[PDB]
Amino acid sequence: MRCIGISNRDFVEGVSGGSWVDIVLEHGSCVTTMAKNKPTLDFELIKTEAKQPATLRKYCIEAKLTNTTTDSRCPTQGEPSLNEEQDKRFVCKHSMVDRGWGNGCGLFGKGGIVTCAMFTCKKNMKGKVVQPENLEYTIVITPHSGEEHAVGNDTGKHGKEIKITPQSSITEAELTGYGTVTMECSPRTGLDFNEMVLLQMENKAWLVHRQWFLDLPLPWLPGADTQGSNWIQKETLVTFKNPHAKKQDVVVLGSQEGAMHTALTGATEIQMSSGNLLFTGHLKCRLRMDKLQLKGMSYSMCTGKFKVVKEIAETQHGTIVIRVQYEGDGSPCKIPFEIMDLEKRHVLGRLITVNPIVTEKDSPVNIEAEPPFGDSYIIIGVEPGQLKLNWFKKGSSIGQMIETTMRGAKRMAILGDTAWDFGSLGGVFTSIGKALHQVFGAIYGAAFSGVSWIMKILIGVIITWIGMNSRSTSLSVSLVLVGVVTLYLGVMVQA
Amino acid sequence: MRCIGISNRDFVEGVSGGSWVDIVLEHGSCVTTMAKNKPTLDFELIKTEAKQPATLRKYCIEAKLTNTTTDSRCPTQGEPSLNEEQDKRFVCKHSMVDRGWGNGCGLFGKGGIVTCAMFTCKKNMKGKVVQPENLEYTIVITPHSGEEHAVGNDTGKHGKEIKITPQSSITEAELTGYGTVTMECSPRTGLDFNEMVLLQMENKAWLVHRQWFLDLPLPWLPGADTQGSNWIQKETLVTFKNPHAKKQDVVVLGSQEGAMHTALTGATEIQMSSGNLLFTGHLKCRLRMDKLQLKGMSYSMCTGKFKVVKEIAETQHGTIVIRVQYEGDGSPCKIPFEIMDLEKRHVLGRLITVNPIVTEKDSPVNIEAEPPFGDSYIIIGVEPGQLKLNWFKKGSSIGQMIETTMRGAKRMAILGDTAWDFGSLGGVFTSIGKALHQVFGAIYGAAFSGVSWIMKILIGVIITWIGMNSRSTSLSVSLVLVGVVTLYLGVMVQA
Amino acid sequence: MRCIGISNRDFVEGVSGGSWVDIVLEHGSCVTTMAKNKPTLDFELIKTEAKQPATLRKYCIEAKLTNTTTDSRCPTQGEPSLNEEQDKRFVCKHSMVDRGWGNGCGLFGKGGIVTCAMFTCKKNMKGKVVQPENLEYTIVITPHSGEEHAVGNDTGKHGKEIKITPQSSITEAELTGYGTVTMECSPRTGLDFNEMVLLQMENKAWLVHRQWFLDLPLPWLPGADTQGSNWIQKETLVTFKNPHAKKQDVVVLGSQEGAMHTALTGATEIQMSSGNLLFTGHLKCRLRMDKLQLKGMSYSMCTGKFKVVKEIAETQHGTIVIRVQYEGDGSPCKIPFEIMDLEKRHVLGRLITVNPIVTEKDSPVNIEAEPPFGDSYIIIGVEPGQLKLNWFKKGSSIGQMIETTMRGAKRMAILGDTAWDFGSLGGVFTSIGKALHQVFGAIYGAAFSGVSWIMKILIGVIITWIGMNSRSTSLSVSLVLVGVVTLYLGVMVQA
Amino acid sequence: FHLTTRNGEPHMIVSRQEKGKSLLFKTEDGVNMCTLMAMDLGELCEDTITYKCPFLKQNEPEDIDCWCNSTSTWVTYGTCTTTGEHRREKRSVALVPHVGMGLETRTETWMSSEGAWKHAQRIETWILRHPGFTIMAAILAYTIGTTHFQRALIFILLTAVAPSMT
Amino acid sequence: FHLTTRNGEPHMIVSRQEKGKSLLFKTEDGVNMCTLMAMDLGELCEDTITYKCPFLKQNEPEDIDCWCNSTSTWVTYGTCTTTGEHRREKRSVALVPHVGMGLETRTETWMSSEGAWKHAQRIETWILRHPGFTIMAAILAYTIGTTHFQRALIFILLTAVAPSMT
Amino acid sequence: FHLTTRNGEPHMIVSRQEKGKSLLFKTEDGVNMCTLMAMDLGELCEDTITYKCPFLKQNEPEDIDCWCNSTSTWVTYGTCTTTGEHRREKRSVALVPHVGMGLETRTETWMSSEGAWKHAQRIETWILRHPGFTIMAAILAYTIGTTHFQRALIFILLTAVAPSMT
C-alpha cells in the first residue's frame, strides 16, 4: 500500500511448497506479494548505500617540483651517482649530451647527465571501489493493512525499513502487528559490481569504469601507502626538455583539475554527499513468510452501515483504490468486499488486501483491488445498507496476458540459474511448480475459467487422456504437457 | 511572330474542348500554340532570375596586412604569450628555431617564436544560394499578328510580359487586340538546387557545384557575420618564409583574380551584367485558351492589289515567312492564302497565323506558314492580280513525321510523371486522349487523309473489326490498338 | 664432434656413385658422414666472406661547397652564360627575379639569374655488389675420435679448416692420420644474389636491395668513376634558397650520416670482422672419400677394464655420449663397443664412431652412439667384468622414421629438379640408388637389422619371392618394391 | 627613428631618412649604439614589421637582423616599395574545378549520332568492366532459355538492363 | 653568494638581490671571479635549481649559463615567477570518458540471455534491414530443396550470406 | 681588400676584420665609397660568396646588399663561422629501409568502387589463400547436392559465406 503510482508495478501471486517465496528488487521497481490466508505485502528498495569503501588508488592531480638537483660527467666517466637516485622521494632520469674540448671536457663525445628532483603532491584525487559485500541495501516493507499516509509517498511509515548487510544473510524484520518475515536477500546473485568506481574530489564525485579509472596516464599512488614517497608512473607530469649541456627546463604540467574536470564532464555525476545512491543492481530476495501472520484476518464479518468518502482515481497499473468510511458500529470487524458481475451471479475480479480490516472508528480505510477489463459491480456490505459501485476499465485482456507472462518470464530468467531451487531434494516438484506458475500462471488463473479448481483439473485429466490416445504423437506431446501443467498447477494454486 | 532563328521551335498542332494545354518550355526554345479558329500564340521565357538571393559564405581574394610582429624568448623560457595573439582579428603561428649562443640569449638551443599580424582584405567573393521559392521566371506571350518588327525581335512592345513565380498561381494577362489569357501556370520542375551555388565578382558571375565551395582552401566568412573580422582557414593565404632566428616575415598570396579566372574556366559562366540567366530546369505551364478572342475572323475579303516586298527568309524548319505589303484598299480584310500542288488540284498546306489580316493600308504584314514537302505553289490574292510564288521545301514526309512525333514524345516525357491529368476521374479519358494526340496526332492529321473525319472513323472501325476478326493474335493486338486510337483521337480532334 | 647444441643436424650415411658425399651445408647447421669400412667425419661451415668486391656505385654523403658564383641580368638585357657552367664539376641553376626602374636597373620585369658553385665532398659511402664467383666459404672437417678437445670445442686442434672458391675447384685437404680428402663444389644452388647489395661506412655495413641502393637521392659515381668530376643528381645536397635580388644564397645541406644511421638501422646489419653473413642459400657440395682408410685399425683390442667418467648425456637428436676411461693397461687399443637388446642376443643399435681407439690410459674417449628409442644395453668392454649399461631412450621409432625420411626427402627435393644426376646413362641406376639411399637409405640401415648385408639381402630376395607369388596384387606392388629397394640399395651400401 | 616605449622597453621607428646607417641615441641606460643591418628597410609603409634588437655585450653577432651594444630594444619599419604597393607578388594555391555541362540536356532524345551511340558505348564499356556479370547473365540465359533465339534475346536483355538500374 | 660544502665541492646559493651582476667573492681557493648569465633567475623560494659552473682553461665562455675561472663550483638559485608561483605550462593530457565496455557480467545467465537477445536482434535486423532477400530465399528453398532439412540449409544459408553480401 | 681586374671589372675581397662599415678605395673614376649591407658575413675562408655590386646614382637602395655612388664592382667574402667551418644545418630525408622487396601495392583507393568490389576481390583472395577449405567445401557440396546444380549452388554459397564470417 506504498507503491500506488510508480511506473514499474509488478505482481507475484504464487507461493512455494515451504513458502520460500522469491522476489527480485530493482531501483524504482516495487513488488507486491500476494498469498492465501496470509497478509499481503509491498516490498521495495528505497535507497542503495555503499558504506566502508575500499581506497583502491590515489592520483596526484597537481604537482610541485622542488630541490631539483642535477649533475653531469665528461664522456667515458660513466653516469654521475648522487644520493637522490636511490631515494624514490625524488623522481629522476639520466641522459647524454655532446661535451668535449669546447666546454671543459677532453674530447667531443656523448657524456652523461643525471637530473633529479623532489616531487611534492599538493592535492589528492580519491578513488573508491565498491565490492559486492559492501552494499548496504535499505529495504522498505509495508503491509496492505489499511494505512493512509503511504500512498504516493516516500517517508510514509507504517511498516519497517531495514538495512541489509550481505555479511548478515538472515535478518528478522519485525513488522508491527503482523510479526516478522525472515530476510534472506542477497545482492551477490545480482549484477557484479566489479567495474564501477567513484572518483571523489573535495565533496563532489562521479561514477566511471575501473579500466578507464586505471588507464589514466597520471601520477599513480597505491592505497596502502600514506606518505606518497613510494611513487609510481613518474613521467606523467615531469616533462623534461631536451638537455642542453646540463640544465633542462624541468617543469611539472599545470594543474589537471580543469582539464580532467572538462573531460569527465558528461559522465554519471553522483551526489555522493547524501550517500552512495547506486542506481543499478538486482537484489534476489528469498523469504519464509510462514512466520508472518495477519492478526486482523479472523475478526467477525462486519455488519453496520458503510459509506464511501472519496471516489476512485485510476492508478498507473490500473487498480481500484478506494478510501471508505464506516459509520456503523462493531469495530473491529471484517468488512465484506466482492467484485461481482452486473447480475450478481459469478465473481470476476481479485482483491489485493486479503480480508480488509476496520479496527478504528471514523477513519479512512484503503481498499485495493484489480478487476479485469470489463463492466463490473463492486459490491460492499450487506443489506440493509448495500453498496453497489459500477466500474469499467480500458484495455485488452490479451494485452495483460502477454504483459504479465513476459514480465514473469523475464523475472524468472534473471531469477534463474543458481536462484530457483534445483538442488533441494523433495522441493524439486514444488520448485518447478513455482517456476511454471511464474511463467504460465496468468494464463492458468485468468484465461482458464478463474478458476473452480476441482472441475478444471477434471477437464485437465480429460485433455491428458485425449492427448495420450491421440491420432498424432506431436499433438500428444503438445497437449499432455499442458494437461499435466494444468493438474500440477491446480494442486499448487489450491495452496 | 517573335521567334525566328531559334533552333528549338516546338509545335502544338491542335486543340480540344477542354483546351487545358500544358506547354513545355525551356531556355533558348520557343513554342507555338495552334487552336481551331482561335488566335495562335507564341510562348517564350525571355529571362530567368532569382531575385533577392541569399548569401552563403564569402571568400577572400586580396589581403592587406599590418601590425606584424615577431616575439620570442630564450630556450627554456616557454614561447611568449602576446596580447596580439588572443584576438581572432589577427592571424598567427608559433614556431621553433635554433637560437645560437651569439644570438642575444647566450644559451644555444631550439626555442619558441610567436609571429603574427593583422589580416583585413580588400576584394572578396560573393557566394550565394538560390532556393526554389526565389525562382522568378519572365514569360513573353505574343500573337501572330504579323507586325513587321517581329523577325529577330524579342522585347519589342507588341506582346505581353508576365512575372511568373511558383508563389503565384493564377493571374490574368491581356493581349491587346486578342483578349485575355490566364496565367494559371505551374513552375514545378526545378532540376536540382542542393548542389549548385552562385558566385559574384564585382561585375561578373559564375555557377559552380557546392562541394567546390566546401573544399576550396581560401579564407572564409559565414553569411551571418558583418564585421569582416572573424575568419576561418585564414592561415592559407599567409605563407611564411622559413624562420630566420628572430626574423619571421609574413607574406600572403597576391592577386588571385587571375588564378580564379584561369582555373574556374570550364564552369558555367553566367552573364550577370544582364542579370542572372539561370539555364536550369524546364517549365511545365498549364494554359486554357477558352477566353481568348480573335479580332478579324468577321472581316470582309481582301479584293485589292497585292504585292510582295521580300521573299522567304528560310528558317530552320523551312517555314515560309512572307513579309508582304497590300497596297489595295478595303482593309481590314481577310487574305487569300492557299498552298497548292504543282498541277494545282487540291490544297494540302498548313497556314500558321489563322485569319491573316492587314490592319491598315501601306503597312507590311509578316504571315507565318508551313507548306507541304517538296515543290509547291503559294497563292496570294485573287485574279486579276493573282500572285503565285513557286517554292520548294527539302524535308522528307516520313522524316519530318518521325521527328515531329519525337518532339511530341519528348514534350510528354518531361510532361510525364505527375504531370498529365491522371487524378481527375472522367477527365482521365480526356487526358489519355490529349496524350495520344500530342504523340500520334501528327500521324493522324498529316498522314491519314488530313482528314474528313466521318469517313476515316468509318474506315477505322472497319480496321478494328478486321483486326479483331484476324487470323493471328499478334496482328490483332497491333491493329485494333491503332483502330481504337484512330476512333477516339478523331473524336478528340473534332473537338 | 662440434654439433652438440646445434639444432639442424643430418646423419647422412652413405657414399654416392663416384664415392663422393653430397654435403648440404647451411649456416648454423651440421653434417655428419658415415659408412662402413670408412671412419665417420663431421662437416661444418664456420665463416663466409667476399673478397675483391665490385663498386657498383659510390655515394658521397657530406658535401662541401666552394667558389660559388652568382650573376643576374635585367629583363631584355640577356641571359648570362659563364664558363663556370660549362665545366661539369659545378652544380648550376638558372632562375628569374624581379627588377625595377628604381631597383638599380631600367624597368619593371623578370630578369634572369645564373648561380652555381663547386661541389666537393669529403665523407663517402661504399656500395658494392657481390657476385657468386667472388665468394669464399670456410668449411671445417672434424674427426670423431673422442679426444677431449674434440667435443664441443670451437678452437680445437683436431679440426682442419679449408677455404673453397670456384677459381680453385679441385683441391686436396689433409686430415691428420686419416689422410687426403678432396674439395670440389660450386655452391650456387642457393638464393639469387643479384637482388642484394652491401653498403659499408668506415666499419659498419648493411645488406639492402639494389633498387633501394640506387633510389636514395644523393650524388652518384659510376663504378669505374674515381675522379670526382662527374656527379649525378648533385642538386639535392645543395639547396638554393629563394630567389632574391642578384643573390642566390647557396646553402650546403648537412651531413646525412646521422640520418643514415637513423634510417639504415632496423635493416640487416653486418660487421666486416665476422665476414658477410649470407646464410641465405643452400650450399650443395661434392666431396670424394676414396683416398681415406681406417687409421688405428691395426691396433689390437685390449681386454682390460672400462670406466665411465661422465653420465649418459643427452643431445637434441636422440644420441648418447659416453666418456669411457680405461683404468687397465695395454693402451692404445681398438675399443670394443657393442649393443644388445633385452634378450642379450641381437646387435640392433646404431654406432657413430667406428673402431674408436684410446690415445693413452687415463685419457678417456668420447664414444657416441644412437640406439633406437627404447630400452637397450650399451655393452662397454667384454666379459669378465663387462659393463651392460642399461639405457631407456625416449621417443617413438615411427617418430624418427617419419622425421628422417621427411628430412632426407626435402633435402633431395630442394636438390631435386636439375640437381640430381639423371642425364648420365648407366649412371641413372646409380642416381636412383642415390635418391633411395638419401631418402630410403635410413630404412635399410636403422630399422632393418643394422645390418650385416649378406643375410638381409638373402631375406630381401625371399621377400621379393613372397611378394611376387602373393594372393593380392596390391600387396605384391607394396612388397616387391620394398624388396628390390632393399637388394639394390644394399648393393649400393656395400660400395 | 622616433622613440617611444612599449612593454617597458624602448621602441624606435626608423625610416628611409636614416637607412643603412648606425643608429645612435642617449637614454637612461646610456649611450645606445644600435646597428640596423636589416634588408627590406625602404621608405615608411603600413606593413609594420617589428623586431627585437637583442642585448649583446661583446660577443660575435650572427644570424640577427639588428642589434644594440647597450640593451635590448624594439625597432620597427615598413616594407612597401617607393611607388607604393602591398608587397612582392607571387602565384600559389592549387585548385581546379570540374568541367561543366551545358546545351546538351540529360535525356535520351534527338536521334543524334553521339546520343544514339552513347547508350551502346556505355553498354559495351560496362560489359568490358563487368565480365563476371556478363558470364552470369549468359549462364542464366542458357539455363532458362530453351531455344537459341530466346537464349540470345534474354542475354541481350539482361546485359542491357543491368547497367540501366545503376 | 652563500657558500656551503656538499659532495666535497662548493655549493653557491644566489638570490635575485644580486641579479644581473657578476659573481665576485674571495676564498682560499683563490680570486674566484665568476659570472652568471642566464635570465631564468627568480626570487628566493623553495623551487631550487642547481648547476655546476665549469673552470676556465683558455676557452671563451660558452655552452654553460654560468662560468667561473678559478675553481669549479656549484651555483643554485630560485626560478619561481615574481608573484611567488612555481613555473608551469598550460599543456594538458586526458582522454575521452564517454563510452567504453568490452566484456563484463556474470558468466552463464548473462551468456545465455545476451546470446539469445544478440542473435535475435542480429537476425531480426538482417530480416528487416534487408527483407526481400529473405522471402525470395524462402520461396526458392521451398521450391528447390528436396527435403525439409535441405530446404532449411538453403534458406538459412541464403539469409545468412545475402545481408552480409548486400 | 685587393682591387683586382676580375672578368675585366673591379673586384674586391672584404673580410671580417672590418664589418658593418662602408669601404673606401680608389679607381680611375676617383675615390669610391662602397656600402655593404650583407648581414650574413663571416671571415674569409674557402666558402667564398661573390657579388657584382651594382651602380646607383640617387635612387633608394632597395632589396640589395651592396652599392656605391660612382661605379659597379665585384665584392666577395667568406661565410665561415667563428670556428672557421662551412655552413651548417639539418636535416634532409632518406627513405626508411626494410627487408624484402615490396612490389605488390600501389595507388590509392576510390571509396565507392572499391567498397562495391570488396566482396568480389575478397572472395577471390580468400578462396585462393585456403585451398584446404576449398577441398572440404567441394567435398561437402558433392555429398549433399543430389544433382549437379544443387552441388554448384551449395559450393558457391559456402565459398561466399566463408570470408564473411571472418
Author numbering:
A (entry chain C), B (entry chain A), C (entry chain B): 1 to 495
D (entry chain D), E (entry chain F), F (entry chain E): 1 to 166
Q: What are the paper's exact sentences on this?
A:
Flavivirus envelope (E) and precursor M (prM) proteins, when ectopically expressed, assemble into empty, virus-like particles (VLPs). Cleavage of prM to M and loss of the pr fragment converts the VLPs from immature to mature particles, mimicking a similar maturation of authentic virions. The icosahedrally symmetric, immature particles contain 180 envelope (E) subunits associated with the same number of membrane-protein precursor (prM) subunits and internal, core (C) protein subunits. Both E and prM are glycoproteins with C-terminal, transmembrane anchors. We describe here the cryo-EM structure of immature, small VLPs (smVLPs) from dengue virus type 2 and show that they have octahedral rather than icosahedral symmetry.
Focused classification and refinement of a symmetry-expanded particle image stack yielded an improved map of the asymmetric unit (three prM-E heterodimers) at 4.3 Å resolution. The asymmetric unit of the octahedral particle is an asymmetric trimer of prM-E heterodimers, just as it is on icosahedral immature virions; the full, octahedrally symmetric particle thus has 24 such asymmetric trimers or 72 prM-E heterodimers in all. We obtained an AlphaFold 2 structure from the DENV2 prM-E sequence, docked three models of the prM-E heterodimer independently into the three subunits of the asymmetric unit, and manually modeled the linker sequence between pr and M. The model was fit to the locally focused map by domain-wise rigid-body fitting, structure morphing, and real space refinement. The stem and transmembrane segments of E and prM were reasonably well defined in the map, in particular for two of the three protomers. Our map is consistent with the revised prM connectivity seen clearly in the structures of immature BinJV and TBEV in which the three pr domains at the tips of an asymmetric threefold cluster connect directly to the three stem and transmembrane anchors (stem-TMs) clustered around the same pseudo-threefold. In our locally refined map, essentially continuous density (weak from residues 215–224, but unambiguously traced for two of the chains and suggested by very weak density for the third) connects each “pr” domain associated with a fusion-loop tip of E with a corresponding stem-TM. One local difference is in the orientation of the prM stem-TM associated with the E subunit marked B in Fig. 3B. In our octahedral smVLP structure, the segment that connects the pr domain and stem-TM of the prM in question allows the B-subunit stem-TM to form an approximately twofold symmetric contact with the stem-TM of prM associated with subunit C—that is, to orient the stem-TM about 180° from its orientation in the full particle. Moreover, this contact is essentially the same as the twofold contact between M proteins in the mature icosahedral particle.
